[model samples]
Target: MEKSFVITDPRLPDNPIIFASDGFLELTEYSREEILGRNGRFLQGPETDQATVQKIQDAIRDQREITVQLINYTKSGKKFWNLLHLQPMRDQKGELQYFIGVQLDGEFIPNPLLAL
Candidate 1:
């Protein structure tokens, strides 16, 4: 299964997010250091397209869980739909402290000819 997740403090500076698992490294091409402390949005590129970005932003703004099928590029420029599952994490005080993103490869569309 080509899947991975990242944990990061949502607080500004948004620093040093950790990639807790290595399953999706083949799709992301990021070493632990490169992804940690970095905005996962860096994965966005000319091919990312705007609608997908809007969906992600809308979900974040609404503080709602969103499962988006995103066509994102790896650091090596490989194309794949990122099955992104995002949620917010709160500190003990109930303050939203971080955003956790779980990513899985979305290339297994049922129909190969219809696959994007």
Candidate 2:
């Protein structure tokens, strides 16, 4: 969607978000101060699919690139589907330096795993 990307530091504790895009800020209504230095899981809510979380967990565990559509919530407690394109941002020497994620508002779909 030609939006900004979020850069995360795996070497840091909790793989915290180091950088975020203004696009994400607009979507989540999160201030830059509140968004940084935290895990993305803060967006998860009760309606979020556990199996989808598991899929993303396995991908991060293997450090592989993956994309997923899942539920997320904003700071104002609004719900939305988030499409995250998560991939490792490596350095010139092939060392995995950061993980970049492109977050987008996903299409609303009818699925058993998600809330209607």
Candidate 3:
């Protein structure tokens, strides 16, 4: 499975991205500098579903895992469908540390009606 990975600092405001894998950069057409210290929401665009965004936000706030498909725009404004899986990572003491996101490009699957 060619999956893209990202680690975000949950302690940071809006959980800014702390690390992103090469696969993630390749998929998003963004450089490390353009990605780090920014929220994952940067990939969202005008056509993105606000309800899906809210679901992700709620999951993060509650420290739960979530899986959803989202229409995301790359650096060049090219639209792509992403199957996203997000989970919270905790420290040994159970302190919320980071949020890990796994993204897979959705090429084989057909787009679903996900608008709010």
Candidate 4:
């Protein structure tokens, strides 16, 4: 039941999390109030490997997609493996819109959905 995802608007400064799903709240133990309008880095801590972050960042800059698994911290100071699926979504006209991230607990695979 660790299915979770987040959407971030790259058009905005700081590239903050615009929307967080209920599953994301459940998996990460974070409320929408605390998660919204904040950089996704809050879930990343010392346990998260820097190289993995580099890969995601590099892909983001290139507006590409990447799937990486790394450790991430929870709101309660617990660490767990995160199989992260990150992608840059483009509008119908190929204009970059938002960055979407899907998270798994490294146990199973699932999905998410919303209007674009």
Candidate 5:
């Protein structure tokens, strides 16, 4: 399967955000180079609720593995449902290296109003 998102080195200058594949290009309106070294938070916009943002922040701050359903906006302000799975990559010394994120497009899925 093609990669949906790129990896970034947050510690690097400008925090370059790389694109792993072209799949996310149509969704974000960003070319491979334009996104590199940029913060992934650039995808967040007015349509993204503050609560969801806070939840993500809190989880990361606590060093926890997180999977969140978020309403994210594209470069042109288009909104979509994103299932973001984030896990921290660690070194042999148990230190964090970087975060690995997998993005799933969830807008086309049915949201049944029934209890799980």
Candidate 6:
């Protein structure tokens, strides 16, 4: 599948971006320099739904995997719908370490009745 990957350090506040795939750079039109150490929420914009954002937040806080479609914007201010799959990464000792996020771009129309 055509997708983007992001690795984030959960030990840090807001789970700062630690790494981004080249596909991510291409998808977001953002340089690696501009993306590193930044929160993924930077992709969110005024039109990005807060309700969906909250669902993601709750899942992260609980250290669970989640899938949601989000309205995101690129560096050039172009909007795109992203199908996001997020999972928590843990060390062998079961210590929460990082978050792995996979994003796919498309006209992902979310079902209104589906729970976030």
Clash counts for the predictions, in order: 2, 0, 0, 0, 6, 0
Candidate 6 on 1-116: residue-level lDDT in tens?
A: 34699999988888999999989999999999989999999999998889999999999999999998878999999998898999998999999999999999975665464433
**Model 4: per-residue Cα lDDT over 1-115, one tens digit each:** 6569999999998679999999999999989999999987789998677877888888988999999877788899988778889988999999999998999886333222111
* Predictions in order: lDDT: 0.73, 0.84, 0.89, 0.85, 0.67, 0.91
Model 6 lDDT, residue 10, Cα:
85
Looking at model 2, report the run of 10 residues with the lowest lDDT sum.
107-116
Q: Name the top lDDT candidate.
A: 6
Which clashing pairs does model 4 show? none
Query: What's model 6's overall lDDT?
Result: 0.91
Q: Flag clash pairs in model 5.
A: 6-20, 15-37, 16-37, 16-38, 17-37, 17-38
> Measured by TM-score, how close is model 4 to the native structure?
0.88
Evaluated against the true structure, the overall lDDT of model 2 is: 0.84
Better of 4 and 6 by TM-score: 6
- Candidate 1: tens digits of C-alpha lDDT, residues 25-61: 6568877766766777887888775787888888777
lDDT of 4 at 31: 94
lDDT of 3 by residue, 1-116 (tens): 34598999988799999999989999998999889999999999997878889999999989999998888999999998888999999899999999999998884345544433
Residues 1-113 of candidate 5 have per-residue lDDT tens digits of 35566565645653356544677676677687777667767888776667767877786667677987667777777787787777766779987667666778775444342
Question: Model 4, stretches more than 4 Å misplaced?
Answer: 107-116
Tens digit of per-residue lDDT, candidate 2, span 1-116: 34756788999987899998887788888888988999889989998889989998899888999988898899989988888889987889988899988887866455554444
Which model, 3 or 4, shows the larger lDDT? 3
- Rank list by lDDT: 6, 3, 4, 2, 1, 5
